[PDB]
């Protein structure tokens with residue numbers, strides 16, 4: 001039989017993911033159905049979101065040739081029934097304290113840093129760029145985790161060197177850009193722009209660099225519809241724009257500038273959002289989500 005989740009020890013939680021100890025060398029990486037918008041975890045879950053994002057991550061791990069932390073199949077008997085399809089058995093690594101970000105387009109904190117200083121994470125950029133400008137080549141824009149409530153802090157390459165070593169910093173930069181370039185080209189061929197992405201890496205017993213966490217989900221990466229890409233304006237979030245529009249619309253009764261917790265979402269908005277996740281997955285993977293495992 002499959003074990004109960006209660007048989008494993010909880011070791012870490014983020015906004016929408018959970019981590020459990022399985023044994024001395026393995027963890028259970030669990031995606032939930034929670035969704036974040038405007039830095040709030042919302043009251044309303046998105047049905048099947050954890051399963052869809054897990055399916056997405058597994059697809060991209062298989063597409064990339066680099067070592068990763070997966071330690072068994074999606075139906076591995078160590079995975080509890082309750083989280084089947086939204087949990088992965090992974091190898092325990094010594095995690096490197098760097099959020100490895102690649103940006104193919106200028107938006108978010110990258111754009112803000114540019115508009116304030118003309119540079120992003122130590123990269124002095126051409127004049128005349130703006131919202132959703134294409135960056136060629138993609139930029140390595142590393143960050144570090146801050147306090148529980150604060151956003152990650154953008155740092156330059158020298159900071160990464162100070163965190164992990166000179167040779168390892170070069171390796172993180174090179175692998176981050178290589179992996180992003182491959183995945184972004186694949187997605188764009190299928191009609192989706194991966195505008196940026198955030199990786200975490202760890203090191204195994206042999207000193208080898210291993211890709212961990214989740215990769216190229218719409219939570220770790222900005223997904224845009226390529227058919228509507230228009231430099232100079234803010235691009236719609238492929239997955240989250242219905243949620244963002246409703247929350248900031250006339251029907252929510254919520255003022256975002258108040259920074260009070262937002263209200264629950266309409267059922268219709270949650271279902272529409274689920275559909276967007278499935279569309280993105282099926283377009284990128286060429287697979288049917290109806291074939292993905294579940295309880």
Ligand SMILES: N#Cc1c(N)ncnc1-c1cnn(Cc2cccnc2)c1
Pocket residue numbers: 012013014017018019027029030069090091092093094095202212213214
């Ligand atoms: N992946 C992975 C991993 C690994 N393979 N080995 C050791 N540690 C980690 C690890 C620790 N924290 N996080 C971030 C995180 C993930 C999910 C939920 N909350 C936080 C990742």
